[PDB]
């Protein structure tokens, strides 16, 4: 008696994500999850299931429903290594473009979640384009530990009932909250309003930025 497994079905992810390249699954996700025991799984199940849907919702936005592994544009590629950190950009200059389901980008957020990971990531950013398991981990990473530019952690955003508009803030708040892009912010809302449709639960408080 208890059934506890992830509050994403194979049925639902796939429903969210009918266009994935074949290099993002179910399986990978699921597989990830153990990296981070907090993630979709504190609070009441209303709340689980709006954590998930919100980092689906994020997920999906940065790489078009899970069809894109990688940033598209090859010319912008050496803007992501940062000079002024001393660690450099020792996989290569062009090497810390977007990748994986939240697209980590710049040489300081590969060593970092690498750090994080036990994968040195700023040697091999590669990884991320090549294997699933490291590529999810990346995502949920982010997600669980970084403020971006905002206050909070996505995870503490939704688990802190502060609003889904916390984690847009912290994915890409400084150019699109306050202002900056409305319709972007709306577009994020939009898809994570669908996702928590899909799961039977709440958008909460606080969804925009
Ligand atoms: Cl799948
Ligand atoms: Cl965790
Ligand atoms: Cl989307
Ligand atoms: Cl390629
Ligand atoms: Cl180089
Ligand atoms: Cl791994
Ligand atoms: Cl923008």
Request: proline share 5%; with cysteine; glycine share 12%.
């Amino acid at each position: 008696g208890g059934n506890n497994g992830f509050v994403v079905s194979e049925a639902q992810f796939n429903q969210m994500f009918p266009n994935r390249n074949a290099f993002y699954t179910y399986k990978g996700l699921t597989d990830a999850l153990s990296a981070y025991p907090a993630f979709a799984k504190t609070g009441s199940d209303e709340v689980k299931k709006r954590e998930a849907a919100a980092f689906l919702a994020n997920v999906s936005h940065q790489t078009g429903g899970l069809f894109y592994i990688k940033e598209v544009n090859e010319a912008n590629y050496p803007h992501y290594c940062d000079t002024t950190q001393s660690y450099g950009c020792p996989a290569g200059q062009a090497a810390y473009y977007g990748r994986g389901p939240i697209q980590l980008s710049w040489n300081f957020n590969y060593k970092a979640a690498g750090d994080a990971l036990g994968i040195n990531l700023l040697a091999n950013p590669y990884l991320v384009e090549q294997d699933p398991a490291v590529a999810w981990k990346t995502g949920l990473w982010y997600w669980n530990s970084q403020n971006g530019p905002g206050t909070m952690t996505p995870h503490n955003a939704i688990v802190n009932n502060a609003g889904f508009g916390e984690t847009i803030r912290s994915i890409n708040g400084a150019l699109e909250c306050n202002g900056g892009n409305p319709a972007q912010v709306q577009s994020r809302i939009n898809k994570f309003t669908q996702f928590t449709q899909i799961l039977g639960t709440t958008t909460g408080p606080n969804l925009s930025c």
